[PDB]
């Protein structure tokens, strides 16, 4: 009668800042919007941007760890893709020019791993190009898939075609997401809903005859992304899974910093993606003996490679964040820490105070070290083991 979900887990990757290839823009925005939509459908979501091949492999391993018998598993990828000899390939940021299958992740490999975990659903939304990488010599010779009638593909374009994004100087959006976002929340069967998305996508003028949605499905059960989650977890195995999820979306506590000079510095943290965190420094209290003072954040772990142009900015938008000034507490100094999947170490930075005393020219510098542990996805220890 009613199809049920043991859990609903999603892994969303958005690559933009390619090292050897044209950088993209819509992946950030699309990822942000899919997460919010997928959360409304009660999904355990993992949002990640600009992953390298190694990094990409670990996100799949963390995602696989969250899938068990009956769990609805969804994968969304927005970035560079190629299709060779019936295999789809997602291209990581670190990819060389020219690249091969070795340099890339094969979707079919991810699918097999999911089937090994007895998942109820296997949805794949590949928002990438699907042309031949003429430079790819290697043909993976992959093992046959087990017939499980729960596999669903939402290809943004068709084989040998391109998926497009509108790069309008402001936000920038992806074409697949423009038609998907308005229909995702519907209680239709996943296949039926994807096909209704395909119709509205044909009505697109910008892409007509260049990009069309391609649905491939084996699904033989009225399963949908709206299907309810087996009420009371109460199972020991179900409890381990909720801990493992919670382990990745832990944000540092908004601390207050007291300085030897009697100055108070409020330190706030915001979440943008599992990979992205925003710090803000507000000067909450200062003694009468000091009137001039600016608080600034420095000495970040070199693993993170934090550009100075993305740190200590008057507004969050100046750091590159998708989050806007109405979402983030007003008047602080905002700093964007993307690439947390690069943190092997514990997060330690210095909150540096440059100040001045009444009636003196000299500029005083009070540096205070801050250890915020492993925020968000850093806490998963993706670099763990030998």
């Amino acid at each position: 009668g009613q199809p049920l979900a043991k859990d609903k887990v999603a892994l969303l990757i958005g690559n933009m800042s390619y090292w050897e290839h044209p950088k993209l823009k819509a992946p950030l925005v699309d990822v942000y919007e899919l997460t919010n939509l997928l959360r409304q459908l009660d999904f355990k979501v993992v949002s990640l941007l600009d992953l390298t091949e190694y990094e990409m492999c670990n996100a799949v391993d963390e995602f696989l760890l969250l899938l068990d018998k009956g769990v609805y598993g969804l994968l969304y990828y927005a970035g560079h893709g190629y299709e060779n000899f019936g295999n789809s390939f997602m291209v990581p940021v670190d990819a060389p020019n020219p690249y091969r299958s070795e340099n890339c992740l094969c979707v079919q490999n991810i699918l097999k791993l999911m089937q090994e975990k007895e998942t109820g659903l296997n949805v794949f939304l590949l928002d990438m190009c699907r042309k031949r990488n003429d430079y790819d010599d290697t043909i993976p010779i992959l093992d046959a898939l087990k017939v499980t009638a729960n596999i669903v593909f939402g290809y943004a374009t068709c084989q040998g075609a391109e998926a497009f994004e509108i790069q309008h100087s402001g936000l920038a959006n992806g074409i697949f997401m423009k038609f998907l976002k308005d229909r995702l929340l519907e209680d239709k069967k996943i296949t039926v809903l994807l096909d209704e998305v395909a119709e509205d996508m044909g009505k697109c003028h910008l892409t007509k005859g260049r990009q069309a949605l391609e649905i491939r499905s084996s699904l033989s059960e009225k399963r949908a992304l709206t299907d309810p989650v087996q009420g009371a977890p109460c199972s020991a195995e179900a409890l381990v899974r909720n801990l493992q999820w919670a382990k990745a979306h832990e944000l540092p506590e908004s601390m207050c910093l007291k300085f030897q000079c009697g100055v108070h510095i409020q330190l706030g943290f915001a979440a943008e993606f599992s990979n992205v965190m925003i710090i803000y420094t507000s000067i909450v209290h200062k003694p009468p003996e000091i009137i001039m003072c600016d608080a600034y954040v420095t000495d970040f772990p070199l693993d993170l490679d934090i550009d100075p142009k993305h740190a200590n900015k008057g507004t969050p938008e100046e750091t590159g964040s998708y989050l806007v000034s109405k979402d983030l507490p007003k008047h602080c100094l905002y700093t964007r820490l993307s690439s947390l999947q690069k943190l092997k170490e514990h997060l330690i930075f210095t909150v540096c105070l440059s100040y001045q005393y009444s009636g003196l020219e000299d500029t005083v510098e009070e540096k205070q070290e801050v250890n915020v542990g492993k925020p968000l996805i850093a806490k998963l220890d993706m670099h763990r083991g030998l």
Partner: peptide, 4 residues
């Protein structure tokens, strides 16, 4: 409108 550019490709991916």
């Amino acid at each position: 409108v550019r490709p991916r």
